[PDB]
Amino acid sequence: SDRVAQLTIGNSTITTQEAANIIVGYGEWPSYCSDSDATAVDKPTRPDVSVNRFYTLDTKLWEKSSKGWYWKFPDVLTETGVFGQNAQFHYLYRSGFCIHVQCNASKFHQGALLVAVLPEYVIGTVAGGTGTEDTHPPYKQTQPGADGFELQHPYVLDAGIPISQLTVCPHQWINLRTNNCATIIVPYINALPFDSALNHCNFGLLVVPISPLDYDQGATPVIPITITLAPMCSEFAGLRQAVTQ
Amino acid sequence: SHENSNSATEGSTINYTTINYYKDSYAATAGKQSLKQDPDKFANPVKDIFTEMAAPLK
Amino acid sequence: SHENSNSATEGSTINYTTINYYKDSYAATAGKQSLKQDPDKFANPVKDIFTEMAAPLK
Amino acid sequence: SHENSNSATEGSTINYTTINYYKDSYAATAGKQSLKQDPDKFANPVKDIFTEMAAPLK
Amino acid sequence: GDRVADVIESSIGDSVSRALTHALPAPTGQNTQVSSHRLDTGKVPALQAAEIGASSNASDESMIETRCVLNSHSTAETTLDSFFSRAGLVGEIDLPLEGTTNPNGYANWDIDITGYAQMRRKVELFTYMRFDAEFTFVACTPTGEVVPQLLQYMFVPPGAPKPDSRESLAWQTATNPSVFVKLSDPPAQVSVPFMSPASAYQWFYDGYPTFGEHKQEKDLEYGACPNNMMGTFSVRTVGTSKSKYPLVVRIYMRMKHVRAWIPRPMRNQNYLFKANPNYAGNSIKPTGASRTAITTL
Amino acid sequence: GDRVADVIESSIGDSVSRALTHALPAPTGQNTQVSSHRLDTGKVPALQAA
Numbered sequence: 001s002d003r004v005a006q007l008t009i010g011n012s013t014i015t016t017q018e019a020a021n022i023i024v025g026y027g028e029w030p031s032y033c034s035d036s037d038a039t040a041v042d043k044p045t046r047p048d049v050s051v052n053r054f055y056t057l058d059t060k061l062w063e064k065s066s067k068g069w070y071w072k073f074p075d076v077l078t079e080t081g082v083f084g085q086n087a088q089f090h091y092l093y094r095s096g097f098c099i100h101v102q103c104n105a106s107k108f109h110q111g112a113l114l115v116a117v118l119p120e121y122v123i124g125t126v127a128g129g130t131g132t133e134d135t136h137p138p139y140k141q142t143q144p145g146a147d148g149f150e151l152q153h154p155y156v157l158d159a160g161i162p163i164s165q166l167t168v169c170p171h172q173w174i175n176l177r178t179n180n181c182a183t184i185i186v187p188y189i190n191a192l193p194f195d196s197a198l199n200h201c202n203f204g205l206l207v208v209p210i211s212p213l214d215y216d217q218g219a220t221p222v223i224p225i226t227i228t229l230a231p232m233c234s235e236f237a238g239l240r241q242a243v244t245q
Numbered sequence: 246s247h248e249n250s251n252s253a254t255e256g257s258t259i260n261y262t263t264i265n266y267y268k269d270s271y272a273a274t275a276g277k278q279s280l281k282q283d284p285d286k287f288a289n290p291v292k293d294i295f296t297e298m299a300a301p302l303k
Numbered sequence: 304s305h306e307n308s309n310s311a312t313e314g315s316t317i318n319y320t321t322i323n324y325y326k327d328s329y330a331a332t333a334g335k336q337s338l339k340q341d342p343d344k345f346a347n348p349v350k351d352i353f354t355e356m357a358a359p360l361k
Numbered sequence: 362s363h364e365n366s367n368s369a370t371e372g373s374t375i376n377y378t379t380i381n382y383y384k385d386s387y388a389a390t391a392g393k394q395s396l397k398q399d400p401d402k403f404a405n406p407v408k409d410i411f412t413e414m415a416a417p418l419k
Numbered sequence: 420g421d422r423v424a425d426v427i428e429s430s431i432g433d434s435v436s437r438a439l440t441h442a443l444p445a446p447t448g449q450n451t452q453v454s455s456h457r458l459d460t461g462k463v464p465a466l467q468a469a470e471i472g473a474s475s476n477a478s479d480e481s482m483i484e485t486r487c488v489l490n491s492h493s494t495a496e497t498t499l500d501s502f503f504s505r506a507g508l509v510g511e512i513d514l515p516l517e518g519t520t521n522p523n524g525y526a527n528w529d530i531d532i533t534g535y536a537q538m539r540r541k542v543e544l545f546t547y548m549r550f551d552a553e554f555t556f557v558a559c560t561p562t563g564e565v566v567p568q569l570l571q572y573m574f575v576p577p578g579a580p581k582p583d584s585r586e587s588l589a590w591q592t593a594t595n596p597s598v599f600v601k602l603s604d605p606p607a608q609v610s611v612p613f614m615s616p617a618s619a620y621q622w623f624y625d626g627y628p629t630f631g632e633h634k635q636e637k638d639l640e641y642g643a644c645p646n647n648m649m650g651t652f653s654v655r656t657v658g659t660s661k662s663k664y665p666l667v668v669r670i671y672m673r674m675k676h677v678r679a680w681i682p683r684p685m686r687n688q689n690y691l692f693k694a695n696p697n698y699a700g701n702s703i704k705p706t707g708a709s710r711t712a713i714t715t716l
Numbered sequence: 717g718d719r720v721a722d723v724i725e726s727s728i729g730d731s732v733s734r735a736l737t738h739a740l741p742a743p744t745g746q747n748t749q750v751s752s753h754r755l756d757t758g759k760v761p762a763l764q765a766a
């Protein structure tokens with residue numbers, strides 16, 4: 001009655017019989033931009049069902065040695081379905097997100113994944129190792145797309161900050177002996193009412209194993225982690241030709 | 246005082262008690278802030294809240 | 304304050320809110336001016352005004 | 362003045378008359394203290410008090 | 420007009436962001452109530468499910484037998500203004516006589532407070548901040564001596580001409596705000612408003628400022644947000660002839676009327692550069708101290 | 717006198733032994749009532765937890 005759940009939006013429905021409730025980032029549901037917060041004057045377009053639906057974008061394999069991965073929003077969807085087209089044809093974009101991370105195993109497997117959302121997740125480099133070289137991360141690392149990217153130094157989140165304090169952000173855990181999914185609802189987070197879906201990534205989704213995956217020889221060794229997400233209250237403005245970046 | 250409303254906190258959910266001698270409010274002192282807190286926004290942002298006595302997962 | 308009315312703006316179509324410590328008003332601060340505007344005086348000084356919908360020359 | 366109650370004597374059995382220009386009361390002057398005294402607490406802390414006329418030990 | 424049902428009953432356009440939580444006044448630490456032994460089935464405060472993502476709701480009262488304690492400890496000193504409204508160093512400007520830096524009697528400093536660790540680490544606890552600020556300027560020679568010298572500080576906002584010499588025409592300062600002061604006078608001090616084009620400044624921007632191909636040679640612009648670039652602070656000795664004294668200007672900032680959003684993990688690796696969170700990859704250190712065994716102090 | 721709360725609200729000294737059961741008169745063996753077939757879910761008298 002808190003373990004079972006159904007998430008229906010658009011022409012897609014998700015089910016889970018081993019949930020752990022739902023998290024609503026910073027305690028507030030997504031919403032459309034009010035006429036007093038807005039600034040751009042053109043009438044926005046709100047596609048609704050064609051873009052506010054669940055998209056399953058990627059599957060990673062959880063291994064005994066995995067370090068963790070991250071994805072950037074809205075980067076992950078800029079080239080998928082109708083949402084992508086609208087993000088490409090419009091200068092302005094804004095929306096919320098419902099993130100559903102899936103990972104099931106057996107009552108004999110163990111391990112725990114920390115699933116968290118970190119706004120304005122700026123990536124840092126190791127500065128040439130000695131820290132005397134001012135290097136910068138490449139586009140494929142700041143905006144990895146749907147395939148995401150693997151963390152090199154999870155302890156410091158590849159940005160000189162302690163992952164041990166990541167729980168100060170909207171998060172959930174996937175502890176195999178307890179639940180097989182994590183659901184986080186995120187409102188639009190920015191210092192502006194609208195912004196570019198291409199140049200700016202509002203937040204990053206981190207999925208990091210804190211307690212290593214383990215099991216005995218003979219049990220299914222392939223344990224996938226699938227990422228499904230849905231935009232909420234998508235709004236677009238500033239129409240012109242399509243642009244990919 | 247009849248000054249300008251150009252402070253960074255003009256229209257905040259917490260009222261301040263400040264001092265100023267200029268026509269621009271941001272020139273004012275820091276004053277005292279309102280002692281309101283909302284821990285749940287960070288410590289308990291769950292959709293369906295669960296009691297203390299009961300078992301969180303049922 | 305009972306001072307002299309020797310300011311450059313004494314008798315202006317816009318009232319000011321100033322501070323002064325001397326008997327001569329021009330010694331006062333700049334204060335705040337009235338936020339009135341009249342763009343038409345420059346942007347549309349036509350005798351017979353024409354609407355937006357209609358055609359200016361008919 | 363609407364300031365903070367952070368003085369060392371806030372809630373004392375003797376009220377003070379002070380001056381201050383800051384939001385923190387301890388910044389205030391020493392002022393004047395209340396002229397109350399209780400010598401007996403030290404000079405005569407006996408359980409069963411004995412009069413002056415009578416003999417202390419009877 | 421609207422006639423088909425799905426349109427009439429849609430929530431498209433709802434601008435009211437529903438909030439699950441609300442603030443309550445809390446001027447003092449919560450009190451402790453009396454409690455006694457409880458030997459029940461069904462009731463179990465001690466057991467939690469951290470997976471949910473929420474913190475434990477268990478309290479002293481339900482874990483041990485408590486007494487009543489009237490807690491009057493204030494919460495005032497932990498407000499945002501209490502924490503930040505304390506002047507700290509955010510900039511140094513040298514005006515040497517014989518040097519390799521600013522030997523021409525003037526200097527331009529890009530307003531950027533991320534050059535000093537103490538102040539930086541505090542503001543980076545939050546993602547977005549909006550505030551006014553009080554700036555104090557302390558000048559003296561490199562020995563701390565006070566000399567009879569006149570200086571001119573000028574705030575050059577983006578787009579205004581940056582002085583290129585001690586006699587530059589821009590010092591006419593007919594529109595930009597300038598402060599003329601002596602090293603003998605007390606430190607100069609002024610109030611600065613919230614000047615960003617955005618509703619708040621942001622210590623982190625996971626994006627690029629422009630469109631196009633973001634090739635290797637432009638990666639230095641990743642994370643650069645113009646909304647945070649307030650301009651230049653220029654200083655010069657006032658004269659057509661070189662100064663007789665070497666000078667140093669220390670810049671202190673005191674935030675006030677502060678609002679902050681989105682808390683984040685606190686820096687645990689030394690800082691290296693102003694513009695980014697880069698860290699020395701070969702010196703990744705634990706967040707804190709360590710010990711020999713988990714079973715020994 | 718008593719003033720601190722934990723003392724006022726304590727059960728220290730309660731001499732009344734609370735009893736969970738009480739005696740009922742039973743001069744004869746209990747009777748047997750009529751019963752019929754029951755084909756229900758949820759109801760399960762036969763299953764116990766010794």
Ligand SMILES: CCO/N=C/c1ccc(OCC[C@@H](C)CCN2CCN(c3ccnc(C(N)=O)c3)C2=O)cc1
Binds near residue numbers: 552693
């Ligand atoms: C006579 C004239 O006297 N004039 C004085 C005077 C003094 C100070 C003035 O401006 C104060 C603006 C300050 C408060 C903004 C500091 N901020 C906000 C965001 N941000 C920032 C964010 C992310 N990254 C970086 C980064 N560097 O990588 C940097 C900042 O540094 C203006 C005028």
